[PDB]
């Protein structure tokens, strides 16, 4: 499922991402925009063998089990395929564990490179939130 910008904003807000760990809703939408282009089915294989899964490109090295990343952790205790559902609940729940990991949203390279310090409010603009 390729979310609309405001649709994803509403889903993330409903799931508790708005100001989760002090990151306003626009940060998550922006992160999701540049991680996955709002596509829940987005997958990207990293060079270390791990794969980023879903609307938030959650990595199999630490957070989800895809059965093909030796030495992984699966800290969100989910199959990585659960991060690709049209329902972003698993991605959000896992994102909360990721953003609470210590580095905040810097865990998302796209957020740090393309959303951090930008006018992330623009991403929830015009959204009936
Ligand atoms: Cl959803
Ligand atoms: Cl933080
Ligand atoms: Na894993």
UniProtKB/Swiss-Prot annotation:
Disulfide bonds join 6-127, 30-115, 64-80, 76-94. GO terms for molecular function: beta-N-acetylglucosaminidase activity; identical protein binding; lysozyme activity. Its main location: secreted. Its EC number is 3.2.1.17. GO terms for cellular component: cytoplasm; endoplasmic reticulum; extracellular space. It is found in: Secreted. Lysozymes have primarily a bacteriolytic function; those in tissues and body fluids are associated with the monocyte-macrophage system and enhance the activity of immunoagents. Has bacteriolytic activity against M.luteus. Lysozyme C is capable of both hydrolysis and transglycosylation; it also shows a slight esterase activity. It acts rapidly on both peptide-substituted and unsubstituted peptidoglycan, and slowly on chitin oligosaccharides. This is Lysozyme C. It comes from Gallus gallus. The lineage of its organism: Eukaryota, Metazoa, Chordata, Craniata, Vertebrata. The gene is LYZ.
């Amino acid at each position: 499922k390729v979310f609309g910008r405001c649709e994803l904003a509403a889903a993330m807000k409903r799931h508790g991402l708005d100001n989760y760990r002090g990151y306003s809703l626009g940060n998550w939408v922006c992160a999701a925009k540049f991680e996955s282009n709002f596509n829940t089915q987005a997958t990207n294989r990293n060079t270390d063998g791990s794969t980023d899964y879903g609307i938030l490109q959650i990595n199999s090295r630490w957070w989800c089990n895809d059965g093909r990343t030796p030495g992984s952790r699966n800290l969100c205790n989910i199959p990585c395929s659960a991060l690709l559902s049209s329902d972003i609940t698993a991605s959000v729940n896992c994102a909360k564990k990721i953003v609470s990991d210590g580095n905040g949203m810097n865990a998302w390279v796209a957020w740090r490179n393309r959303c951090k310090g930008t006018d992330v409010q623009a991403w929830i603009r015009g959204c009936r939130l």
